Amino acid sequence: SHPTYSEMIAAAIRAEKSRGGSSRQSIQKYIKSHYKVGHNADLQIKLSIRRLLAAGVLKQTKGVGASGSFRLAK
């Protein structure tokens, strides 16, 4: 087991230190090195971020070249 993808993505963002937020890359490398996830985790981490951004719980920032960064809305 592991918690829900959303709960693993909030643990992954709470551990980041930055004047931006976490990248989808940062969040897949944290979750894969700390929980017992399977081979479809890539897919599952993108799907929950798409959902968590729509529900209002993640916020995002985009720049030029800046591929996408995620912070917890409060």
Q: Report the C-alpha gap between 30 and 56 in whole angstroms.
A: 22
Residues 32/9, Cβ–Cβ less than 8 Å: no
Pair of tokens at residue 54:
């729509």
Q: Report the C-alpha gap between 23 and 58 in whole angstroms.
A: 12
Resolution (A): 2.6
Helix 5-14 to helix 24-34 angle, to the nearest 10 degrees? 110
* CATH number of residue 20's parent domain: 1.10.10.10
Full domain range(s) for residue 47: 1-74
Q: Report the C-alpha gap between 68 and 65 in whole angstroms.
A: 9
Residues 55/10, Cβ–Cβ less than 8 Å: no
Amino acid identity of residue 22, one-letter, is: S
Residue 22: exposed, middle, or buried by beta-carbon count in 10 A (0-12, 13-18, 19+)?
buried
Quote the number of domains for the chain: 1
List the helix and strand counts (H, then E) for the chain: 3, 3
